[PDB]
Swiss-Prot record, chains A, B, C:
Name assigned to this protein: Ammonium transporter AmtB
Annotated membrane topology: Multi-pass membrane protein
Annotated organism of origin: Escherichia coli (strain K12)
Compartments in which it is found: Cell inner membrane
Regulation: In the presence of high extracellular ammonium concentrations, transport activity is inhibited by interaction with the regulatory protein GlnK. Ammonium transport through AmtB is required for GlnK sequestration. Formation of the GlnK-AmtB complex is influenced by intracellular pools of the effector molecules ATP, ADP, Mg(2+) and 2-oxoglutarate. The rapid drop in the 2-oxoglutarate pool upon ammonium influx and a simultaneous, but transient, change in the ATP/ADP ratio promotes AmtB-GlnK complex formation.
SUBUNIT field: Homotrimer. In response to elevation of the extracellular ammonium concentration, interacts and forms a complex with GlnK. Interacts with GlnK with a stoichiometry of AmtB(3):GlnK(3). Sequestration of GlnK is reversible.
Cytoplasmic side: 31-41, 119-122, 237-242
């Protein structure tokens, strides 16, 4: 295998766009939602934990997520990237670029959790939790889905991380919760998240090809359909649209199309978008509401991927010998496994912090 | 024709940059200019109409703008992108990428109009207007200039949309008008518009070649020359420069070089920049002032393209058998047609809304 | 030599990212630090001087920096880019793209100086200074390091501008000084600087290859290590971390890895990051503090490059026949020359302005 320079270029720029989603996208999103007296401390926590994830990833994270091992974890052969030649190729790009791209996914996943709970948790406690949950939840689930583990081996479909990123993070946020002063700032964060999400979704193709093109167009369409679905529902129930409603609808569509984007047709993208925007509004009606959107819209997206990948409905098609019924059962099992795995690990992380330093802010 | 992956990569990233111009560039620009009590509602209108344009484009917009038809419109053969194979090539890129790029141009054009008039117009009325004006003005003019229609057939020169985007939108804004509390926010929006404009101007080449390179350098030079021309004029007339003056000068140069950027030399870019910055200041002296800059600077740019494309002046050269006099007459005719076409359609759109829901805010 | 379109694409996008560092990155960074009554005037000065640098670069700047001449300056053969054919290739890209990329480096260097001193200096005086210092300091030092001049001829290692950008600007700021109201704004500027810095560091490879990949990964790692080093030091000395501390640590790592990024291993990047973050904190303890970070962290970075380029330590290796001792001596000499050259020229610029218009604000 030799590296293609067009693919090297595309994938480095997509990596920069995903890093932009955390620094400053998710920080500004939460910054406009929470109480003003809490903004400075939350911004500090997001920045410090981002740095921590970047370091853990290179020391051992990449090796245990993407090295060859078993169904649940990889190996320790790639510690500090040892034994990876600079000219080594993964797919059609230099392996060093694959390291950076996958690291940026771990960063945004952790940013989602830390932003929402920074108000309520002690600084030393959040650091302990991130170390436990990244090592024992993010890494294994990434291995299972994208690193040749249990879920991949059974043919699960998840293009850009409905399970790995969204459901994984949403469950961890909810467990923590159990244990808007500046709307122009919220809008600015939403917009930066949207633009960076093209790197997130299209970059998951690993090459500047027709599947990257499909994922790009589907991202535009599903986001737009979800803005419109949320806003219509808000007009019907509340009498009029709102700015926070429009931004929430955008996020709902982006989350919903995440697992599906490289597998479905544009018609499918429009239908997934509308359903996701409405499911999101239902979800928040029943800033920890962000875990309601990422969780509900993630499950909806993962199920609907097992429908709209069908050739009959404009998709790329299921694998050889796989019926729609079979794919649907596999999607359901992958969602169930992600929920229980993340839920158990988070509980352990929060409890270990509480025994060592105490959880609640002094 | 086979797709080139370097061109696929370049054009997907340029599309993301043009979407960044609307979400959040133009929204933050207007957000700092208008009254504070009106900011939230304007941001909501920009976001909802952006979603509407994205959907209309994929349902029928692309087909009637870029399909083969007559001098004024295309066809309905590409509804919801039916009959476009995923591997179909347009120029040197996948056709799906061309769909996304051209859609992003329709979005920024509509954002220019909606941002300025959101204070004054009822929500349901703006939705009606966008549907009428996009369908009957944006689409036909795009077909005429870039889709093999009337103006292209007569050899009109317009690299990135002096007519299609700027004059088209400026006239529609002026008809509506007939019928700064946060300057750091205005500066931030201006800066995001500038950075995204490299995707807008260089991406109009359709490939990562020497014409894309020329357009890039000309964008840097004309923007800088227009900042300096506006600021000098402000010092002469008002006694000193201002922040709003500097931002306005930047926009003036960007608008002026839009039709010319892929056809002229760097010397030509510097001259066009200076004249545009001064014409812009004259224009505002005689946030609906934004329609004064986009309109005056658009006309100036379109005329000056018919001069500075000449080989003698450092340009790429006129087509075979075309004198400078002939090109100039064709530029003038293209400007006249755009003004009357947009003016008539806008009047019809505003009037239909007024008869159905009433125009003015309740 | 023929141009590679993948490299053309990569280098145009990296240029847009470096322009983003000045407009609006450095402007927002300083905007949150200085007194509120001074913000508008500083933003105006940054914008006008940016335009001035763009014009001077194309008129004569590129020619005297990158044309063939002597050890200290180039020539006047490329005035207004005359005699450069549109299809001319430099390395593996069109020469017009090289012009734009190198111009963006001159812009950020000047932005660093103007942002910090805008409060204190008269407008007409800053314009005079920029003209003198760009022409007689930035241009010659760029020629010496990257244009085949004195320092390159002796084998100096400086991948992305520890001398040319950071030490050069830091000394000029300090000479001027001799002669935080909005922390969310400071965080936003820091984040935009970080994202743009991938274009700055990876783009310095000139191609989308394995050296660009190495520079990208090293940027992620050194920034993260420096955030952690600064924050630890702040906890030890001050009792707790702060938002301004975290942002300062990020900048320290970015500056430190600038000269080293394309030459060192990931282990080396982590060590350079930690040392830079701690040296930065020491430096500020002993907004002109920004010249303390860029100066101290620049020197540290330039020295440590002469160590960690060694094959033994995971680097790409020294040139044929060059020991670690020899490279270290050459690094020290390059730092000494940059300090004295910039220091002398700045003194002359500030003095000429003071004799013509007066330096201090009226």
């Amino acid at each position: 295998a030799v590296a293609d320079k067009a693919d090297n270029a595309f994938m480095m720029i997509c990596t920069a766009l995903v890093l932009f989603m955390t620094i400053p996208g998710i920080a500004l999103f939460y910054g406009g939602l929470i109480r003003g007296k809490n903004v400075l401390s939350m911004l500090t926590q997001v920045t410090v934990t981002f740095a921590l994830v970047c370091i853990l990833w290179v020391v051992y994270g990449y090796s245990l997520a993407f090295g060859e091992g078993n169904n649940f974890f990889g190996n320790i052969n790639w510690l500090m990237l040892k034994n990876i030649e600079l000219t080594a190729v993964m797919g059609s790009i230099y392996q060093y670029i694959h390291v950076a791209f996958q690291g940026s996914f771990a960063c945004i996943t952790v940013g989602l959790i830390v932003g929402a709970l920074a108000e309520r948790i002690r600084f030393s406690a959040v650091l302990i939790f991130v170390v436990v949950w990244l090592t024992l939840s993010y890494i294994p689930i990434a291995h299972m889905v994208w690193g040749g583990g249990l879920l991949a081996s059974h043919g699960a479909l998840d293009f850009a991380g409905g399970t790995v990123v969204h459901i994984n993070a949403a469950i961890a946020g909810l467990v923590g919760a159990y244990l808007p002063h500046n709307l122009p700032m919220v809008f600015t964060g939403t917009a930066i998240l949207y633009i960076g999400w093209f790197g997130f979704n299209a970059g998951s193709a690993g090459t500047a090809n027709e599947i990257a093109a499909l994922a790009f167009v589907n991202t535009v369409v599903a986001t737009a359909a979800a803005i419109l679905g949320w806003i219509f529902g808000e007009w019907a129930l509340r009498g009029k649209p709102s700015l926070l409603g429009a931004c929430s609808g955008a996020i709902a569509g982006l989350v919903g199309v995440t697992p599906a984007c490289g597998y479905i047709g544009v018609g499918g993208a429009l239908i997934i978008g509308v359903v996701a925007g409405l499911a999101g509004l239902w979800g928040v009606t029943m800033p920890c509401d962000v875990f309601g959107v990422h969780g509900v819209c993630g499950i909806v997206g993962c199920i609907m991927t097992g429908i709209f990948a069908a050739s009959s409905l404009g998709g790329v098609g299921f694998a050889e010998g796989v019926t729609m019924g079979h794919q649907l059962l596999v999607q359901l099992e992958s969602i169930a496994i992600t929920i229980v795995w993340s839920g158990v690990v988070a509980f352990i992380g929060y409890k270990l912090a509480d025994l060592t330093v105490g959880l609640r802010v002094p």
